[PDB]
Ligand binder design. Sequence first.
Ligand code: ATP
Ligand code: KVR
Lengths: 107, 204, 273, 97, 436
Amino acid sequence: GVQVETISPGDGRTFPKRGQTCVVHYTGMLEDGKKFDSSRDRNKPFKFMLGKQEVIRGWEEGVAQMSVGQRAKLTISPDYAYGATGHPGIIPPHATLVFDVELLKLE
Amino acid sequence: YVDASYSSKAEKNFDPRPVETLNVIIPEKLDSFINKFAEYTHEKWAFDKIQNNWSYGENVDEELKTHPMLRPYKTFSEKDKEIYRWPIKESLKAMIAWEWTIEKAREGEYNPQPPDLSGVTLSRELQAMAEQLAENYHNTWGRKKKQELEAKGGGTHPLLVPYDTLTAKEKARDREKAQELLKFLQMNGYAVTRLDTSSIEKRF
Amino acid sequence: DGTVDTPPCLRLAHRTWGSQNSLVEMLFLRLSLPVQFHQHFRCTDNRDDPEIILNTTTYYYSVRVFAGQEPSCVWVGWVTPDYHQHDMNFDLSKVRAVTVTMGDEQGNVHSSLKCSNCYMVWGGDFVSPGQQGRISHTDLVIGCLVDLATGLMTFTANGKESNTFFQVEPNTKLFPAVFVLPTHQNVIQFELGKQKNIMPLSAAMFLSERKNPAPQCPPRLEVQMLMPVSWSRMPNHFLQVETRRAGERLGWAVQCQDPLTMMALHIPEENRC
Amino acid sequence: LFAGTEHRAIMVDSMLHTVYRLSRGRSLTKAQRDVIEDCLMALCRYIRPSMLQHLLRRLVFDVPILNEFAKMPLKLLTNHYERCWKYYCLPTGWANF
Amino acid sequence: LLLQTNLINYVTSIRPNIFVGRAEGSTQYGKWYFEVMVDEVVPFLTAQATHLRVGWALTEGYSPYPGGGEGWGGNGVGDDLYSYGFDGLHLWTGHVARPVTSPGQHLLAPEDVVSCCLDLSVPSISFRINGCPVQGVFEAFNLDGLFFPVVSFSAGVKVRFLLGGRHGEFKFLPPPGYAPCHEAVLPRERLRLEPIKEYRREGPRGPHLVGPSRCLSHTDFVPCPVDTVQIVLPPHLERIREKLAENIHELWALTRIEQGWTYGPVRDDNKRLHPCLVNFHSLPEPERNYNLQMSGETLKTLLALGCHVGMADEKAEDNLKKTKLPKTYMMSNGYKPAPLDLSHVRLTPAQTTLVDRLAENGHNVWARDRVAQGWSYSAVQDIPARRNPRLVPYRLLDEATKRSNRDSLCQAVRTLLGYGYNIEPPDQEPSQVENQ
Ligand SMILES: Nc1ncnc2c1ncn2[C@@H]1O[C@H](COP(=O)(O)OP(=O)(O)OP(=O)(O)O)[C@@H](O)[C@H]1O
Ligand SMILES: COc1ccc2c(c1)CN(Cc1ccc(C(=O)O)cc1)CCS2
């Protein structure tokens, strides 16, 4: 349930594989247009490693399809995010999440 | 300031003198219009009923709040037709008594298909005569009204004032009636004839 | 208040009609709360059925044009939260409209959406050309139906379905609105009622009343009028924009480098900040 | 107290005509006549100019006669137009009138 | 329920002073084209993405104020129903972003060229990025105003307007039938880049407060000559109407002699040859009758404007001096044209105002006649394309040409006064247009 729509092209050659740390800058909004999270506000890039289930499964496939330097828009269905339980106080249940993710680098 | 009605009677409580025309003989050479338009005004009342959204009826009744004896010409008795012409008869007497000769330039001739309206404009010289005739409507109306009122000697009707003094809202009654007669004379081509002042010369 | 035979209403009256110094001009009214269409649309006696009424997504409200108010000077419908057209000579031709058309590499239009900020009907379309008596004995009761699960909007003249209809996109916010030029002491009346197997507006405006078929007029719901001018605060700093003619072949250059940020307070129901 | 009687203009206009008609009354003593005239002068000083239109219409018929009864209307007209000259002359009219 | 807060960037719009529109009888062309080239964009100068949109906006309604507004602020092109923008990935209108497909979709980046086409006939707005068509068009929108190019942006951008001609060479050839936007600049104004409805600007000693700005309307480009349906000229005016055409032709021929025109079988401005540049009588009658229709209106407009004119003097017409061209200032033919000598003639200040009104009407009559023939206004003259720099209403005309028409009408009035005919200046009726 992840759809990846490109915003700005990357290198198109290097892609993140399993066990590699991904450094991304993201801004997450509900699909109706309400923002709820953004790494830009904290002014600190978000780091995570693929395959360790550190993030929601929607980010697992979405970032894997992106290249280094690419900025893309990921639309994640409720099943590939928090879903029925949701995130209490942040994300309502059965909410589709839209993310503007830029893959800064891999480490 | 320029007065819209730049004219006056230049005459003289208030006694509205009517116009004496019964003494003088009424010319009947134009009887093709005298009788036709006399019943045409009441024919226009039939068109006024369909605009009232309540149609005409034969039986006399006070529930229809319209004319109770208005009937189609097939079953329209002429007893009312032969009494509604009197206001028109004196109306033609009135406009011909004020040294206004009328000449028929042209030579020709249940719903009044030709619609008589009053929203169109007209020339100043000819419209001035209509307003003068409308004045004669008011003073004759004032004369008969004051005859009943003069039996008391105290008070007066609020509209017992000269025609030029009363405002337009209370004038539209006689104004439209005189204009409507002139409009009928307009499309047929009746020439009635007995000034040219610019707006600058009309300033106070 | 809603009686046994009438629903709760918000009636507008002209205080100084007929008297000297009375103000007569186009009046743009709307209700204070919107109805929001669903995020996703569905694919493809006189008693409400309990199962139908609890599963329907159609909502109804009506406007009563009192006798004496000319229907030709009344417009009834909905407005989006971005309506700012204070036209003293308003008619349906002044309504903002635009069509966005998408296609493939060679024509072949596959999507043609229609956008507007005002979805209304003219009261002059619901009057027969009678000879006269245009001020009718019966008040004109224009009803509006919105289906939040399909984005379809329909109207009724006096219980007869009208030909005009509108289609809107999901997540659209619509405010019940009436544009009227007063011609009588009694002008209009928002009727927050319901039809058979159709929920009232209070069921759509409030989360706690989604399954309540009883019409309600809570205090937050009120009539709002369009005010042409309002006070606004001037920003303390403005973007420094440099404009110059770079040359005959380079054209005119626009440049802005220094960032500026403001803290915006957003009102959710009005979709403005 | 007659300053804002626009809502009852019909009754106020009738009052003005009656008191004026009383002034033009035979079998009235000189002392009685001035009391009627003083009342008419006082009323026209506070009544709005728009509500004096009908009274002026009656005066147009009577004042040009210039008989012995025309003395009071001449003074009444003098005070009216001196007080309300902006109502008739200025294109914008008198303020709030 | 609770009020929401967030940090947003300020967005400002910049437009050229180029205004186009469509109206019945308007003198403006229908199809326009311009380009915007992106030189430098910082994708994230702040926590919020950089704003950059290109498109068209309507004069009556598009007033983006700095700060708050619809949605979450930062309103630019396409954030209302008066503007239609394009940011590289979406078509913006009514504060709604609709994705659009183009070869190599990406957000507006440096070295990108955006081509915007405006066809008011449909009406339709289309875009091209780097020469490839954008598969999405705005259409069936309102036309009650004037359209201008506009770019909305936040801090961290650097773009250049390409308007054609000497104001930015086009990177790509415009589609056939479309005209460069530089041709739409009015004669009285110079092309420049300005903000939109600003209430504040920088000044020498401090910020300057600015009130509302006077804006033109689409109806301002529609000539409105006075009505001349009432074609009833007095017989003395009718006969002198043709003689008026004789005199104005000589005056028009005389002014051409100052410009260097000589007699010639061919009538060309550059060749400076004119068959009329011999004499009014030697001028061919059919050529004289070319302006007889215009000459008839000139006297007719006097009656139409309300002027009282009659044959006050007949002996004055019989005897009058004739100015002749100097023998030194001769044409190819060598004859001396003899226009009426009216040096002794003087005009009252009220009559001078009448000449201005006559000149304005004469231009409008010519303007609406050309519009019916398909002519349209353009900064650059193109006879095969029927584009004329003077195809504009008289009020929008530049003073240099405005004075030229005024002088010609003055001689025509002088000719009437030379004949001794009385000319009564009408009592001018003031009016308030209420443009805004
Ligand atoms: N009959 C007319 N024909 C042409 N222009 C006229 C006429 N009457 C007035 N004008 C004015 O002349 C100007 C335009 O003239 P135009 O461009 O046609 O001149 P030209 O090129 O010298 O003439 P031509 O096209 O006959 O060679 C405008 O200001 C217009 O108002
Ligand atoms: C006001 O009136 C005008 C104003 C300007 C011009 C003309 C007539 C003339 N027209 C063509 C023309 C030229 C010469 C003659 C002639 O000499 O007979 C007739 C017509 C366009 C050229 S500029």
